[PDB]
Design a protein around this ligand. Structure first.
Ligand SMILES: Nc1ncnc2c1ncn2[C@@H]1O[C@H](COP(=O)(O)OP(=O)(O)NP(=O)(O)O)[C@@H](O)[C@H]1O
Ligand SMILES: [Mg+2]
Ligand SMILES: [Zn+2]
Lengths: 568, 153, 311
DNA sequence: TTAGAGAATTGGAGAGTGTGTTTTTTTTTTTTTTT
DNA sequence: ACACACTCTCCAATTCTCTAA
C-alpha cells in the first residue's frame, strides 16, 4: 500500500507473467510515478522541454490526443519501453491517466473541455508487412503498412456495459503492390478506428498503422474449416501517411529574372526530347487561368483543356505519366476524383457522352429511381488520340482524322498534331539522347547531383512547390489599354477566315486567348496580364486554329496571318 | 524474465519408400504414414489454432487449465470449486492458453498422370508450425504426413 | 564442386554461343533464326528506371507467323517443356478472366507466368474483347481488379511468345505483314521480333528433311545428339542471368549509325524509336549469353542483323 | 446358526418446465432488336 | 402445438444392522 519500489527493483519480474506483474498496486503506482517524472522532465539538447511544449498546444487546438515518440521513451527509463512493447493494453491505461495530470498542470479544469486523453505512440522501431504476422504476435504492439482498400461509414457505439457513446469505423488494409513477392496474390487485414481516428484516411491511400494485434472466437470460421480456428483484427493506436518565407523569396527571385517562362517550359518533361509546343500547352494547362461569373447571363471557366493527336510512338503516354507524377491531384484513364485537378486520357459511346456533358457543364447532375443528386467536375482535361487508324493525313481537315463531334473541337482550348517526321539530323539527335539517357539510368551523392543538374535547368522539387504556390496565391487580371487592339485583331481574323471560305473563328477562341494570357501571367507570378502575354496566347490559338484546316486554306491563312503567327 | 513455456517439438520424416497419387487415397489407409504429390491451386491465409485452453469462472474466483480441443471449440464441464455450481459465462484466458499456426492448401492431380477419358481429382491439405506459407499457387510439390477424417462439426 | 567445374569448363569454350544456339529445340530441322530468338528471350535484357521514376521495359516479346505444317507449335511445346516459369494457352479455348484473373479472387495464366514465358497458340483465333485485355496487361506489366466492393492491383512481369495463322491460311508475298495478319496495329507495335515461316519447296532441302523425319520415327532417342544436356543448359542459363552488362562508348556511337540506316530503309511496318530500345534489349541479352559485362559493338551488329530479318 | 424386525441409502418414474420451428460476377444456349 | 432437452421431486426397492430362539 504505502511503500513504493525503486526503478532498479522493477528490473526483476517477480510474478509468473508480465501482465500479472504490471497489474499489482505497488508496481502500478511505481510505474505511474516514473512516467509522470519522465513527462515533466525530458529535454532537447537545448533544454526546451518538448512535452511541456506539446501539452501547451494541446489546449491551443482544443484537442484530445497527446503524441509521444517511442525513441524518447527508450532513451531513458528503458524498462518502461520494454513493458510497453510487451503489454500495451495495460501500459497505455496507466499512461493515459498520467497524461491527464500533466495537462491539468497547464490548464486546470480542462476536464470540462474533454473528459479523457489518449496517448498516441510514434516511431515504433520494427515493421512487418502482412506476411510476417504469426500467433506469437498476439496482444503485442505492431507497426504495419499498406493501401486502404475499403472504408465503412462512421457510426456511434456504446462505450460502457446512464449511457455514453464513441465514434466507430472499420477499414480494410491491403499489401502495397511494390512489397508483394512475384507470382503471389496480396494479403488483407481489417483495422478498427475509434473516437479521434475516424475519417483520418480515404480509399486508395497508402497508409502506415501502429496498434495492438488481437483475436477472438468466431463460430462460422470454426464451422466451415472444421478446426478450432480463431479470427484476428488490428486495433489502431495511431495512423500515418506549406512553405517558409525563404521559399517565397526564392520564388520571387527566380520570377524577377528574364526568360522564366521559357525556363519553366524547358524544365517540362525532361526525359522527352523535342516537342516544345506540347510542353508549352501542358505547362499552360497545369497553371491555368482564373474563373469568372456574371449573374447577368454568363460564366467563364479557369481550367484549360488540351487535345493531342499522336502518330504511333510520339511520346504521348510518357508525357501523361510525367504529368501524373508532376501534378498535385489527378485522374488517369471518375471525374469526381479530378475535382479542382487535372484529368488525363491516353486512348479512346457512353464514355464520350459523359465527356460531352462534362465539357458543357462544370458540375454533373444525375437522377435514378426518383433520387436526385449533384457532383462537381471543375477540372482541366488533357487527352490524346490516334488519328483514325495508322497515320494522320495532312491534306485533310481535322474532322476527317478523328472520331469526335464538332463541339468537342470547339470547346477544347488548344488542339495540336504531332507526327513522326523524317530527318537524318533529328533522328541522330533523338538516337544520341536516347542511348545517353539509357546509360545514365543504368543500375550500375555527387553522382546524383551531377545527373540531376544535367537533366533539367530547374530542380523539379522547387518547380512543383512553385506550381502549388502560384496556383494557391496568384490571381491575375487584364489591362484595359490594349484590349481595343485585341478586338480589332479578332475582327480581322474573322474577316480573313470568311474571305478564304474557312470555317469561322468564334467567341470561344477569344475567351481561350484571354484565359491563356492569364495563365501566362500566373506562370511568372504576375498579377497583371501584359501585351506579350496576349501576343503569346494569340500565337498559340492562331497556330492551333490554322493546324485544323485543309492544305490550300492553310497556305492562305499563314500567308495572311504572318503578322500574328510570327510577327505582332 | 518471467517463466518460459515449454517448446512444442515436431518430428518429421522423409525418404519414404513410395509416393501415391491423390486418386489412390482410400479409407483402408486412414491414420497410416504416407507421401503424396500434386500441383497447388489455392492457399489460405495463416490463422491461429487453439491447441490448449484455460478458463476462469465468473461467479467465483476459480481457474481451469490444460483443456483439450480436437475438432471443435471445447469448454469445462464443472466449476472446480465446490462452493459454486455455475457452468456458464466462462472466458478463455488468451495469455495462459496456447495456439498454433495453421494453413489450408488445395491440390489437384498432375496432368501427365490422368487416365484415359478421365479428369483430375482434388484434395485439401493442412500445414502447421514452421511449414506455413512454404507452398505457392501453380507450383508442383511433394507432401508427407497422415491422412485423417474430419467430422460435420 | 563438380557442377562448378563443369560450368567453368563450358564457360571457357571459344564456340559456346554457337553451341547454345544449336542446342535449342533439338528435334526441329533448321530454322536457326527462331532458335536464336528463343535463346535471347529466355536470357532477357536488363530492367531499369530513370531519375524521373519512369520504368524502362527489360524483356522481349516474340511472334511467329506461318502457313500450315511449318512445325511452329513445336517451339511453344519446347519452351513450355523447358522454361521453369511458363504456361501454355490456346487462343480459342480461353477467356479474359482465365487469362488475367477472376472472381470466385483466383489467378489467371499471366499471373502464373510472372517472371516467366507465356505461350499463346493460334493467337489469331482470340476474340478482340480478350486481345485488348492482353494488350492492356502487356502495356503496363500490371493487372487491375475493381468490382463488388473489392479492389486489387497485381504485378505481371511476363514475356509473351505467340503463334498465328496468315489470313486465308497462306502468306501473300504481294502484301505487308499487316495485310497478311489479323492483328490490330497497337498490339503488333509491341512485339520485339516477328518471324515469318514459308514452305519454299526445294529438292535439296526436301531430300534432307524427309530423311531427318524418317530417322525420328525409326530411332526414338538416337537421332537428335544435342550439344548439351538439358540439365546442363538450365544451369548455364541460371548462371548467365546473374550478369548485368554495361554499354561501351564505341557501342553508343555505333548504335545511332545503325538506327539511321534503319530509318533510311524505312523512308512494311514503320520504324519508330521503339526499335532502338528493342535493339538495346537484344544486345544486352547477347552480351549476357556470352558471360561478358561489357556490350562489345559486335553484339549490336548481331542484334541489327537479327532484327532486319523481321522486316 | 437361522431368521425376522427396524433403519438407512439409492433409482428412476414420472411429472413438470422451458424451448425452437414457418419463410458482381463467370460460363453457355437461345431469342430478339439494333447497326 | 408439437417433439425434444433438461430439472426436480417422491416413493419404494434394496442391503445393512441388531436381537432372540
Ligand atoms: N524522346 C523520345 N521521342 C520518342 N519516343 C521516345 C522518346 N524517348 C523514349 N521514347 C519511346 O517511344 C515511345 C514513346 O511514345 P509512347 O506514346 O509512350 O509509346 P506508345 O504508348 O507505345 N505509342 P502509343 O501506344 O500509340 O501511345 C515509348 O516506347 C518510349 O519508350
Ligand atoms: Mg503512347
Ligand atoms: Zn464458480
Amino acid at each position: 500500500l504505502r511503500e513504493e519500489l525503486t526503478l532498479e527493483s522493477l528490473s526483476n519480474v517477480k510474478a509468473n507473467s508480465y501482465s500479472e506483474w504490471i497489474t499489482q498496486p505497488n508496481v502500478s503506482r511505481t510505474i505511474a510515478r516514473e512516467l509522470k517524472s519522465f513527462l515533466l522532465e525530458y529535454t532537447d539538447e537545448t533544454g526546451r522541454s518538448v512535452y511541456g511544449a506539446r501539452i501547451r498546444t494541446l489546449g491551443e487546438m482544443n484537442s484530445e490526443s497527446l503524441e509521444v515518440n517511442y525513441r524518447h521513451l527508450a532513451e531513458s527509463k528503458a524498462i518502461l519501453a520494454l513493458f510497453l512493447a510487451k503489454c500495451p493494453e495495460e501500459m497505455l491505461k496507466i499512461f493515459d491517466l498520467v497524461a491527464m495530470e500533466a495537462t491539468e498542470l497547464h490548464y486546470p479544469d480542462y476536464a470540462r473541455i474533454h473528459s479523457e486523453i489518449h496517448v498516441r505512440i510514434s516511431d515504433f522501431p520494427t515493421i512487418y508487412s502482412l506476411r510476417e504476422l504469426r500467433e506469437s504476435n498476439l496482444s503485442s504492439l505492431v507497426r504495419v503498412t499498406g493501401v486502404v482498400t475499403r472504408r465503412t461509414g462512421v457510426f456511434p457505439q456504446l462505450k460502457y456495459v446512464k449511457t455514453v457513446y464513441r465514434n466507430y469505423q472499420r477499414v480494410t488494409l491491403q499489401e502495397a503492390p511494390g512489397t508483394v513477392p512475384p507470382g503471389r496474390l496480396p494479403r488483407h487485414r481489417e483495422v478498427i478506428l475509434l473516437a479521434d481516428l475516424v475519417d483520418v484516411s480515404k480509399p486508395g491511400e497508402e497508409v502506415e498503422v501502429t496498434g495492438i494485434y488481437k483475436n477472438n472466437y468466431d463460430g462460422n470460421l470454426n464451422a466451415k474449416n472444421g478446426f478450432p480456428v480463431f479470427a484476428t483484427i488490428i486495433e489502431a493506436n495511431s495512423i500515418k501517411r506549406s512553405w517558409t518565407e525563404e521559399e517565397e523569396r526564392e520564388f520571387r527571385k527566380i520570377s524577377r529574372d528574364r526568360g522564366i517562362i521559357d525556363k519553366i517550359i524547358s524544365s517540362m518533361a525532361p526525359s522527352i526530347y523535342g516537342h516544345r509546343d506540347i510542353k508549352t500547352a501542358v505547362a499552360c494547362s497545369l497553371f491555368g487561368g482564373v474563373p469568372k461569373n456574371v449573374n447577368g447571363k454568363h460564366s467563364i471557366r479557369g481550367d484549360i483543356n488540351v487535345l493531342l493527336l499522336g502518330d504511333p510512338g510520339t511520346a504521348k503516354s510518357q508525357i501523361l505519366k510525367y504529368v501524373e507524377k508532376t501534378a498535385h491531384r489527378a485522374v488517369f484513364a471518375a471525374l469526381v476524383l479530378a475535382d479542382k485537378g487535372v484529368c488525363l486520357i491516353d486512348e479512346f459511346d457512353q464514355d464520350r457522352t459523359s465527356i460531352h456533358e462534362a465539357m458543357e457543364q462544370q458540375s454533373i447532375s444525375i437522377s435514378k429511381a426518383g433520387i436526385v443528386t449533384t457532383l462537381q467536375a471543375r477540372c482541366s482535361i488533357i487527352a490524346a488520340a490516334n488519328p483514325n487508324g495508322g497515320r494522320y493525313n495532312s491534306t485533310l481537315p481535322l474532322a476527317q482524322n478523328v472520331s469526335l463531334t464538332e463541339p468537342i473541337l470547339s470547346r477544347f482550348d488548344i488542339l495540336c498534331v504531332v507526327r513522326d517526321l523524317v530527318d537524318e539530323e533529328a533522328d541522330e539527335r533523338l538516337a544520341t539522347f536516347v542511348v545517353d539517357s539509357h546509360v545514365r539510368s543504368h543500375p550500375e551523392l555527387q553522382r546524383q547531383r551531377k545527373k540531376e543538374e544535367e537533366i533539367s535547368p530547374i530542380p523539379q522539387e522547387l518547380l512543383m512547390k512553385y506550381i502549388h504556390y502560384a496556383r494557391t496565391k496568384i490571381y491575375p487580371k487584364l489591362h484595359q489599354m490594349d484590349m481595343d487592339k485585341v478586338s480589332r485583331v479578332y475582327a480581322d481574323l474573322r474577316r480573313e477566315s470568311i474571305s478564304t471560305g474557312s470555317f469561322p473563328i468564334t467567341v470561344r477562341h477569344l475567351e481561350s486567348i484571354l484565359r491563356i494570357a492569364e495563365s501566362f501571367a500566373k506562370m511568372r507570378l504576375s498579377e497583371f496580364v501584359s501585351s506579350y502575354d496576349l501576343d503569346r496566347a494569340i500565337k498559340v490559338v492562331v497556330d492551333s486554329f490554322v493546324d485544323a484546316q485543309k492544305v490550300s486554306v492553310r497556305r492562305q491563312l499563314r500567308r495572311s496571318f504572318a503578322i500574328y503567327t510570327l510577327g505582332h | 524474465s518471467p517463466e518460459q513455456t515449454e517448446r512444442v517439438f515436431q518430428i518429421s520424416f522423409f525418404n519414404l519408400p513410395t509416393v501415391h497419387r491423390i486418386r489412390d487415397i482410400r479409407s483402408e489407409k486412414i491414420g497410416s504414414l504416407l507421401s503424396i504429390s500434386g500441383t497447388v491451386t489455392r492457399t489460405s491465409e495463416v490463422r491461429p489454432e487453439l491447441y490448449k485452453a484455460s478458463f476462469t469462472c465468473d461467479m467465483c474466483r476459480a481457474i481451469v487449465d490444460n483443456v483439450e480441443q480436437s475438432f471443435k471449440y471445447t469448454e469445462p464441464t464443472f466449476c472446480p470449486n465446490p462452493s459454486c455450481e455455475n457452468r456458464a459465462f466462462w472466458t478463455l484466458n488468451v495469455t495462459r492458453s496456447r495456439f498454433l499456426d495453421w494453413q489450408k492448401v488445395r491440390i489437384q492431380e498432375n496432368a501427365n498422370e490422368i487416365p484415359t477419358g478421365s479428369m483430375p481429382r482434388t484434395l485439401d491439405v493442412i500445414l502447421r508450425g514452421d511449414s506455413v506459407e512454404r507452398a505457392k499457387p501453380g507450383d508442383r510439390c511433394k507432401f508427407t504426413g497422415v491422412e485423417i477424417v474430419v467430422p460435420d462439426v | 564442386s563438380d557442377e562448378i567445374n563443369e560450368l567453368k569448363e563450358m564457360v571457357k569454350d571459344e564456340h559456346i554461343y554457337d553451341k547454345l544456339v544449336r542446342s535449342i529445340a533439338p528435334a526441329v530441322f533448321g530454322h536457326e533464326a527462331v532458335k536464336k530468338g528463343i535463346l535471347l528471350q529466355m536470357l532477357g535484357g536488363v530492367h531499369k528506371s530513370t531519375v524521373e521514376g519512369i520504368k524502362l521495359r527489360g524483356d522481349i516479346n516474340i511472334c511467329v507467323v506461318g502457313d500450315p505444317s511449318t512445325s511452329k507449335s513445336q517451339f511453344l511445346k519446347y519452351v513450355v517443356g523447358f522454361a521453369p516459369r511458363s504456361v501454355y494457352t490456346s487462343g480459342k479455348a480461353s477467356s479474359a478472366a482465365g487469362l488475367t484473373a477472376a472472381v470466385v479472387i483466383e489467378a489467371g495464366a499471366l499471373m502464373l507466368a510472372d517472371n516467366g514465358i507465356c505461350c499463346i497458340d493460334e493467337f489469331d483465333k482470340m476474340d478482340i474483347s480478350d486481345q485488348v485485355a492482353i494488350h492492356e496487361a502487356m502495356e503496363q506489366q500490371t493487372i487491375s481488379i475493381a468490382k463488388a466492393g473489392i479492389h486489387a492491383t497485381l504485378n505481371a512481369r511476363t514475356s509473351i511468345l505467340a503463334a498465328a495463322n496468315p489470313v486465308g491460311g497462306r502468306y501473300n508475298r504481294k502484301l505487308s505483314l499487316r495485310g497478311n495478319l489479323n492483328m490490330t496495329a497497337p498490339i503488333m507495335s509491341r512485339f520485339d521480333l516477328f518471324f515469318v515461316i514459308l514452305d519454299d519447296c526445294n529438292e535439296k532441302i526436301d531430300t534432307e528433311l524427309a530423311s531427318h523425319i524418317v530417322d525420328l520415327h525409326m530411332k526414338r532417342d538416337e537421332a537428335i545428339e544435342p550439344p548439351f544436356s538439358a540439365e546442363q543448359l538450365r544451369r548455364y542459363i541460371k548462371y548467365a542471368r546473374t550478369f548485368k552488362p554495361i554499354l561501351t562508348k564505341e557501342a553508343r556511337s555505333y548504335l545511332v549509325e545503325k538506327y539511321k540506316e534503319l530509318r533510311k530503309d524505312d523512308a512494311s511496318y514503320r520504324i519508330t524509336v521503339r526499335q532502338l530500345e528493342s535493339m538495346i534489349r537484344l544486345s544486352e541479352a547477347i552480351a549476357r549469353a556470352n558471360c561478358v559485362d561489357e556490350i562489345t559493338p559486335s553484339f549490336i551488329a548481331e542484334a541489327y542483323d537479327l532484327l532486319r530479318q523481321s522486316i
